[PDB]
Amino acid sequence: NFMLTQPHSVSESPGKTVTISCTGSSGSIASNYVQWYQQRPGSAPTTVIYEDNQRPSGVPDRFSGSIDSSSNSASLTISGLKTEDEADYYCQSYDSSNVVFG
Amino acid sequence: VQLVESGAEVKKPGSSVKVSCKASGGTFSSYAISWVRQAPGQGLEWMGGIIPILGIANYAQKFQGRVTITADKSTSTAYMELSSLRSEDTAVYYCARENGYSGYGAAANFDLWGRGTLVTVSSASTKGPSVFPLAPSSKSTSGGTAALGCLVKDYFPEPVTVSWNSGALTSGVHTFPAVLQSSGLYSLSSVVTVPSSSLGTQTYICNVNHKPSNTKVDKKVEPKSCD
Amino acid sequence: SGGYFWSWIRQPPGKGLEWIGCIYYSGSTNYNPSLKSRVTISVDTSKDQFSLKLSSVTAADTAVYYCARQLWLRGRFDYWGQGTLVTVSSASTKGPS
Amino acid sequence: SVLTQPPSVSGAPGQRVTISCTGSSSNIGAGYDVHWYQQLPGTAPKLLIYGNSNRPSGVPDRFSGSKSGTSASLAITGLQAEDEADYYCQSYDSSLSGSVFGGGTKLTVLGQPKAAPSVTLFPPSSEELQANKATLVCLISDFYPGAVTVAWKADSSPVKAGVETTTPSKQSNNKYAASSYLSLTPEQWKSHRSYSCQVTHEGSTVEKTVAPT
Amino acid sequence: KRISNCVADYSVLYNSASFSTFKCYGVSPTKLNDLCFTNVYADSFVIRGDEVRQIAPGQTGKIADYNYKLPDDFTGCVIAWNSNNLDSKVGGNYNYLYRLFRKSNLKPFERDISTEIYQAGSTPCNGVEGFNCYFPLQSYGFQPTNGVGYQPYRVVVLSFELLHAPATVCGPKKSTNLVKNKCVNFNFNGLTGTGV
């Protein structure tokens, strides 16, 4: 019964800094690895962060993630918003042998 | 401080042995108390340690659930109860103490030790002792001195003291140690050399005392007539 | 070869991603509790492919199915296949007027 | 078990005597400390040194403890008149989930010169014949050291049943005394012609015979 | 636990599909086998469900500061799972202990087994259950009928050693699939031959 809570609508003007949260209900957010996926409309999702702080080769440095384990919330910080950044963001978990998305 | 245990104790193979560890003074309710056993013929092994202030039992994986340790803080005395005694339990326990410290190692050390409870279990248990006097002969005595004494047989358990004329004879006395038998029994002797001039005037009697058996039998000795 | 996993992930139009189940090259399988007792996935190494079978499909099962490679069982789906469109409707295929 | 120690070591009164203790990588190799104890035969063991870095009260500074990685070593300087005891290794074992002691090293070489033994044979008395047993005792006294083997014979064949030998104790004049018994029955005691005990001490053999009839 | 003169794989220790939690910083989980270190230290202990959160580099609390301090340059992995059906029993399982009070901070990778009574004020107690002092060691509250936040969890730590020394442990080439009936190059102990 572990579900990740995400803000449905987030808007920000280009060039500023915005924070996207991902709150876990029952399980703690530092228990399992959290993966963020940025999916274009009409396109396959792509992994933009892994291990909750490590950026895969290819994505910009701005995709920075932080973990606030006291509030059981996973945070993804975006700096310098651009045109191509307009995409769906989903946070991933594992719980216990049952992968749960955001 | 000074921790004192009990003395020797002999039980049955299949009975329950109850021993106690006594602490004189204080510093017993603030440190963990363990038990260390030493066995002649092998090394030392550690059963487990008991924290007395909170009461948590912490034994070892090499020992199964047969021996239990209970501690009382009203009189600062810990009690040990062991059941199903086997043939390889003939050893001595000790009352140890744990004094923790800080460091990279953090190893448990036993700075304080007890005296020792001699717990031995075997067959051929406590029966009625038999005393046999020994008399000299005309062929074994050639000089001015003769060897004579008393023989103790079929006695259990150790120890047994031997007194000569209620302690009136001390010169030339000797007590021999015991020895294991195939049936699990001990035997000891005492021989005193006296001049032959006092044989016909002063009589000798052996006093055999047995404090666990609560028996005190005295038998006189008489010289042989034919030899 | 390589000791990696396979997983099926679906996404309804306008909704978030939903995890269906994951498979190994052996018979190890784990399914979502909401999708339990309905997901049947098998691996045929001879054809170098794996297939998923679904039972009792309703009109709410309309989602874009994504076959994504999964490197770490608790981690990222590094490679995502292109999503095929699945539509569930109750009629016979008929020509337009 | 997991700790192995040498059976005995040799030394001289005035040189350095060292010991080596080798175990495993999970009890002493992990980083735990050692505690060395002295097992005197007749009194309770006490604490000598803990952690190989501090000196407990009442312990002389001649004892030194070191941990050369996996193996731990203890070195002393000079052999005094109290080193006739046993040394043990004590360390916490993670596999055993508790403390385990070592094997033990005895520190002694010699100190027992020779002497001239004297034996005595005493036949059983009259009252011992009605108890359906026969305790044949052959006493050995005034000898040094206390290492005497006892052999029994009935002038026709050695007796290999019922033989016993007690450990010898210290006498008042710093000598040794011992006894040896033999369990027989009165039924066959009178059948044999004679009985005797045979002992050897550095090539010196003394034989004493008795006649029941 | 110290592992030396051995060699092993971490793939078996991951595909169990039974660990509730998994945390490894410092190295990527999928690229740690081929990277080779010298020694591996295994630190195994038990902890409650509300204290697995505090076991992370850079967090405070009452367990991560009084029992085991995690340094900033912590490159180990933490593997934890639930085994409440064996280490707990009805009637109250109090066999596990933990420390609640300490005089000051402690160095990382250091164990404390001091049973001395912690002093809060300036008056000595001479080791009694008197005033202005309390025992630092407290028993747990494990119960088989607990929820998901207070059961006994088994937490282990697998740190790595990096020094001027050879690798006691290493990640050797795995058992590649034995592909057949294809033109594939192989090297079976004496030759680098290509063929079906």
Residue numbers in the entry:
A (entry chain F): 1 to 102
B (entry chain N): 2 to 228
C (entry chain J): 31 to 127
D (entry chain O): 2 to 214
E (entry chain B): 356 to 551
Give the authors' words.
During the first 3 years of the pandemic, the spike (S) protein on the virus surface has been actively undergoing antigenic drift generating a large number of variants. Being a highly dynamic protein, SARS-CoV-2 S-protein has been observed to adopt RBD “up” and “down” conformations. Our structural study reveals that interactions between the VL6-57-encoded mAbs and RBD are mainly mediated by germline gene encoded residues in HCDR3 and LCDR1, while germline gene encoded LCDR3 residues support HCDR3 in antigen binding. We provide evidence to suggest that the identified class of antibodies constitute a potential immune pressure driving the genesis of S371L/F-S373P-S375F mutations in Omicron variants.
Notably, H18 exhibits detectable cross-reactivities with RBDs of SARS-CoV-1, Bat CoV RaTG13, and Pangolin CoV GD1, with affinities ranging between 134–332 nM. H18 has mild neutralization activity towards wildtype, Alpha, Beta and Delta SARS-CoV-2 authentic viruses, it also possesses activity to trigger conformational change of SARS-CoV-2 S and exhibits inhibition activity in the S-protein-ACE2 interaction mediated cell-cell membrane fusion assay. When paired with other RBD-specific antibodies, binding of antibodies to cryptic epitopes may also result in spike inactivation by promoting S-trimer disassembly.
